[PDB]
């Protein structure tokens, strides 16, 4: 997250931290995620497409820091990694960048609701907030495009939804952005999501309720003028989400 503020897991109870084990024992951070149900975390497919092995991932809930523990946190193994089959990456656009991670603790249990661990509500069929609406994003991603390290503490910021018409302008992204994607940015281009925030949640208050409106997917640079963040439009994938989370 470029700019924005430091926050704790208490303020983002549905945020899931995903790590990958390496040969030797070194675990590195991979991507953000969101707990949508006790046994399921939703994220982005491009985070795992190069290493489809479920056995090498670790999911953390109730965690506020990157490389240290937090009281109340819970560790999970990935029982099943569901990548979208029509995923593809073009020059800039990442299509169908969405993924499901079924989780289970070593005792074979799913997440237990606490003050630091809660689910986030999914939207309704083609029912998104009005353009110009403020939403929030959370992540352990870069604070500056030039950094090579990630902040140790979780962060968040607020951005506004941009209309599909505006995001499709020549100086923005042109035809790279489709209706399955959502654009959001700070009107002053000061704050934004960045490398390392992928798979994290774009939350919007819709009719007095926090809703997982999007998933951090892509963008040109970070906090660059007329280069909004692009998010996978959750509302267009409900059918896909339900068919894979049943049995
Ligand atoms: N809101 C943003 N600007 C933003 C959101 C998410 C990411 C994370 N996702 C990726 O990096 C995946 N790749 C991209 O978006 C690529 C194009 O397909 N564009 S990029 O190379 O400009 C992103 C980038 C990479 C390294 C450092 C800064 C920016 C980056 C920027």
CATH number (domain holding residue 197): 2.40.10.10
Strand (E) positions, 5-46? Answer: 5-6, 15-21, 27-37, 40-43
Handedness of CA 242, 30, 72, 203 (dihedral sign): negative
Sign of the torsion formed by the C-alpha atoms of 79, 85, 90 and 93: negative
Are residues 2 and 97 located together in one domain of the fold?
A: no
Residues 130 and 230 reside in one and the same domain: yes
Do 105 and 21 lie in one domain? The reply is: yes
CA–CA gap between residue 129 and residue 123 (Å, rounded): 10
Cα separation of 94 and 220, whole Å? 12
Q: Give the separation between CA 105 and CA 89, rounded to whole angstroms.
A: 33
Our CA dihedral for 144, 149, 150, 153, rounded to 10 degrees, sits at: -110
193 lines ligand 1 (CB under 6 A): yes
Q: Do residues 39 and 88 both lie within one domain?
A: yes
The DSSP code for 104 is: E
Domain co-membership, 105 together with 141: no
Classify 211 as helix, strand or coil: strand
> Based on the domain organization, do 73 and 86 belong to the same domain?
yes
Residues 227 and 128 in one domain: yes
Same domain, 4 and 17: no
Closest CA to 187 of 151, 223, 152: 223
145 and 214 inside one domain: yes
Atom of ligand 1 lying closest to residue 46 CA: 12
Determine the Cα–Cα distance for residues 151 and 140; give it in Å rounded to an integer. Answer: 6
This entry's atomic model was obtained through: X-ray
Q: Is the same domain home to 21 and 76? A: yes
Catalytic residues: 46, 97, 198
Q: What are the φ/ψ torsions at residue 143 (nearest 5 degrees)?
A: -100, -20
DSSP states of 135-191: EEEEES--SSTT-SS--SB-EEEEEEEE-HHHHTSTTTTGGGS-TTEEEEE-TTS--
Verify whether ligand 1 is closer than 6 Å to residue 47 (CB atom). no
Q: Which residues form the domain of 75?
A: 13-119+236-247
Residue 197 CB less than 6 A away from ligand 1: yes
Distances (CA, A) of 206 to 42, 111, 212, 245: 19, 25, 10, 24
Q: Are 44 and 35 in contact (CB under 8 A)?
A: no
Q: What is the DSSP letter of 129?
A: P
Same-domain check for residues 204 and 143: yes
The span from the CA of 33 to the CA of 46, in Å, is 12
Q: Do residues 52 and 149 both lie within one domain? A: no
In this structure, what token pair is assigned to residue 95?
């299509």
CB contact set of 10 (below 8 Å; sequence gap of 6+): 64, 115, 116
Return d(Cα 101, Cα 33) in angstroms, integer. 9
- What is the widest separation between alpha-carbon atoms in the chain? 53
The structural domain count of the chain equals: 2
Residue 46's DSSP bridge partners are none
């Amino acid at each position: 997250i470029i700019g924005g503020e430091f926050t704790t897991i208490e303020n983002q109870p549905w945020f899931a931290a995903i790590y990958r084990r390496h040969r030797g024992g070194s675990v590195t951070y991979v991507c953000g995620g969101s707990l949508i149900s006790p046994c399921w975390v939703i994220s982005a497919t491009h985070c795992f497409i190069d290493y489809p092995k479920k056995e090498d991932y670790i999911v953390y809930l109730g965690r506020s820091r990157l490389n240290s523990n937090t009281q109340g946190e819970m560790k999970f193994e990935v029982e099943n990694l569901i990548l979208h089959k029509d995923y593809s990456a073009d020059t800039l656009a990442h299509h169908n960048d969405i993924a499901l991670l079924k989780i289970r603790s070593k005792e074979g249990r799913c997440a237990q609701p606490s003050r630091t661990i809660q689910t986030i509500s999914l939207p309704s069929m083609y029912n998104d907030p009005q353009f110009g609406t403020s939403c929030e994003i959370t992540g352990f991603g870069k604070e500056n495009s030039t950094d090579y390290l990630y902040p140790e503490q979780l962060k968040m910021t607020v951005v506004k939804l941009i209309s599909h018409r505006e995001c499709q302008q020549p100086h923005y992204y042109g035809s790279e952005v489709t209706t399955k994607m959502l654009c959001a940015a700070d009107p002053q281009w000061k704050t934004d999501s960045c490398q390392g925030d992928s798979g994290g949640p774009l939350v919007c208050s819709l009719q007095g309720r926090m809703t997982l409106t999007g998933i951090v997917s892509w963008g040109r640079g970070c906090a660059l003028k007329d280069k909004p963040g692009v998010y996978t439009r959750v509302s267009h994938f409900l059918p896909w989400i339900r068919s894979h989370t049943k049995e």
